[model samples]
Target: AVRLIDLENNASFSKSLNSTTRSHKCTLPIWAGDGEGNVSDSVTLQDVLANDALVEFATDKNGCRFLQEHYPTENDNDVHQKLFRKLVEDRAIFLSLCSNMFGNFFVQRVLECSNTEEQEILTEHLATDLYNLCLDKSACRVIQLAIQKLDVHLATRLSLELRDTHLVRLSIDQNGNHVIQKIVKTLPVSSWTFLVDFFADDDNLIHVCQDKYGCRVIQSTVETLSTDQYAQCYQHRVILLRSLMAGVTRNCTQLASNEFANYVVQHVIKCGDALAVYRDIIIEQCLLQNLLSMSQEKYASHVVEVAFECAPYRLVAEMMNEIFEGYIPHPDTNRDALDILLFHQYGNYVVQQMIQTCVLGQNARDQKQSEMYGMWLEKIHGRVMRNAHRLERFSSGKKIIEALQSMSLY
Candidate 1:
């Protein structure tokens, strides 16, 4: 689901390695701290497992049983500690294969090792041989067990590195693009549609996406559109909202629950202020101004009524306040501040609130739901805060201050 851009094969390999490392580092819980008395109650095994990228393949019972058996106990720390120790102890083996695989590939493509007349050998060929040797059946058990025991992020990265490296050797002509495309095609229709909509420009594409995957893609795409493009893309905006509503209606009918469907639709329309910046961006980009004008002529009153119907009451109130008086800066207002204020911040807050609400409402009836939600909420809040702190290092004082202010409100 992540994008890799503008890198040649070697660089892409390095970036993938880096991403894997970073993802692992980022997702590991603080409770996983040095095996001291520094563990926090907020940290849980589930938190570690959920974001752990390798659980899909590495874990027994796909990591569910692994988490249940180990986490929140002293034994859990021991399990990870032992694994880290093994990696350290077996550093030679791991590093040898890793370096040989990556190094050989790098030399072949980036350094053009094959062109050396003195060697009369292609590095790609050597890399391929090395890769196959490492992936031999004998290595599977060790690799798979290592994958199970390692930190989720680390395991995932290693798996991807192995898989991708092998794939690179297997399908070298297309330079991995074809392979990536095929892998992407195998993703769920909704996920694929969502990705296309993320970068899509054509209305027809949006329409096709809505028809095929329902309107979740439309909503996600609209929500992702840049703030400067939203105002100009008013027609797209209308269409997206309508599609979302229609999808909800359809789903509701299928479930035979009109009230539940209406609730979801209404909540999405009302509570989706996180998408306001995207809408504004589309408007500013003139993506919908022409269409809006055209609609006024073609549909007249019907268009107006639809617009009125889709408009969020809270947004309308804010608009009236701005119109009647003057623009008031959002609580956090730095010109170059990261747009996290618009979406990420709000999305996290909403997720946290939902988790808490679910926990509280189910505590009496569903103990498991209550416990799970509480654990998840704690984990997410910790992660969000950790990310916020990390972002501060790369941000300007003004931006950091603005972000902090925005977070404070949530």
Candidate 2:
């Protein structure tokens, strides 16, 4: 039998039969009753058991505290995962709508036109809208989405028309505030590769020119070719022109010299057979000539150097070779020699004058000024000589040279 009791001094037990007895007590070792006991009075099993229970309680409390501290972080992780999934799903839907809307917009505009003139006007308007859209930060996301959805046909037409119309406006602005000009300045040539690819086929080429605001120059050229034969040829020519221009614009902005720019304008105005056959090729030749000349003249020298540094020399050399070898021959024979003589005489005269007046400083009194003058002349002479050599090859060696000379004299 067992009895429960409060150990407090003031507390009373339910039964106190031995209160007046001798009160003799035995402090038995806790292990002694279990046979793993010790008779010693030092330490007992009860003490060890109490210590172990306290340690276990502390360990459990620490574990619970650690879990409580980390719970919020774990919940946040779960929330982010769910939100990310939802965002991805939403983006897909948004992209689909963007594509459909742009396609519908193009179709609607084209369908509204009754004649080629009206179509051209509408096309220009559409291009302006797209340009504006590109400039708007808030609109870029949807604009990019729409751009991605465009089929090859629409994208090709849109890009070309946009560039052409914008260039016209930019040329006239004089302030140079045209959006297309800025866009061309910033974007890479590779970005325009899609436009080239879309119009790579023959049928697409004809359609592009036939549409309102189509390339008038290309259209006039197309009229001369067999409708079937010209299509392929025209496509090739268009690609060639756009690709060359894009590459030049990408690698050498400074190479967009007045000579080449003027050449483009002249061909656009002439809209004739000669321009059709060689407009882009001639522009390329003119750019190389200008760059070479500038390099020698110390005008835009750094820009020429940078362009040469960035562009492959072999490619430039190949282009030069093509121009020198492929230029259409003139009907007259002495014309080529006369042009060559004029070019050579002009170049040589410039060097001679530079050496006499600038280098020797025939007019200078001081030694220091004379030395400076000499150095400047040396630099100028070297540049002139190098350019002269390049021009000589084009004017003197080939059959076309003779033909050109004849035409000039005639």
Candidate 3:
């Protein structure tokens, strides 16, 4: 009652309608039913529209909820049509609702209930400001849904409208990055070839991967291609995969050690069989070459561990050899890399992962593989025993000794 009572004052009326302090349930004014049974209480969507409060109501928290609840069920050609015409009448008002804090949800609801013609109209109005809307926290979600619900033709046009430059910008924004992720996930390779081309640039790749949110989009794109979702685009998929991996490959050294970007490398490793080719490149070109330095550092250690977990048996053998033979012969301060790593904090975990890797490889189906891994295990045991007393000096060292002792008994 209080909301409708101030209908003449738009500002206060919207404020009054939106405010939830009053205990009364929000309802339209009840009308007396005549013998024809023409009416009852509670404001319908038509009632709000009839009073020229659609915009004011749609922007209000409570008013949007009311419209969303009542607007859809009013049939295909009835109240929703009326509301659509009202929004279409003023393009500014339509765009305004798209980004409005509360009104954005109402716009999404409109998208959900809209027919083909209605959607094209909404999309037409939304076309110019698509980039700005994507950067908006509330409006971006509407764009995501529009892609999900839009007809393929409309969705393609809408997605392609985002130029290459805009995609890079979007990939870095807190709000806009999600839209990029959604696009990669929802659209197939045919529509988003520009995505691969843009990310193909080494600078663009590093800039995005190093960011907190942008890395997620890269990860999503890699994983999306990693899955066999679009087998028809096999050649294109391989090209896209190679382009994304090329950026990671070129910048693997920098990305592997970065605080945020390391996860992208780790994700690339963890993608397993589908990305094995790129994995070999990263392992050979970036990881194995800098094994000692990376194993000892913080972020890069994670990448090393994932590499150990996912690399093939041949690569695993190479990695184990890299740690054992590569470090054992060259001692710094009379301590080989393995001995130093067994005691060092972050390095100890890599050593542990290495031992864990050997243990896992021991049960390999191939006899030669198992024998080689068992021999590596024996070598690790011999080293642990030789340094048992000294290894007891630190927490990291003690864990190494314990792991070796447990392995021997089992």
Model 3: CA > 4 A from native: 1-42, 74-77, 229-234, 328-332, 390-402, 405-410
Best by lDDT: 3
lDDT of 2 by residue, 67-126 (tens): 123222232354323322221233333223223323223222223322343334333434
Return the clash pairs for model 3, or none: 28-42, 28-43, 30-41
Pick the winner on TM-score between candidates 2 and 3.
Answer: 3
Better of 1 and 3 by lDDT: 3
- Tens digit of per-residue lDDT, candidate 3, span 186-293: 986676778888887888888888999999999998998889644564366877788788879988999999988999899878887678888888998888857889
* Candidate 1 Cα misplacement greater than 4 A, ranges: 1-63, 72-78, 84-204, 212-214, 226-305, 308-410
Model 1 over residues 301-397: C-alpha lDDT tens digits? 2222222234433333232222223333357653111123213432223232333343343343555544544544454344445555555554332
| Candidate with more favorable, higher lDDT: 2 or 3 | 3
RMSD of each: 25.5, 28.1, 7.4
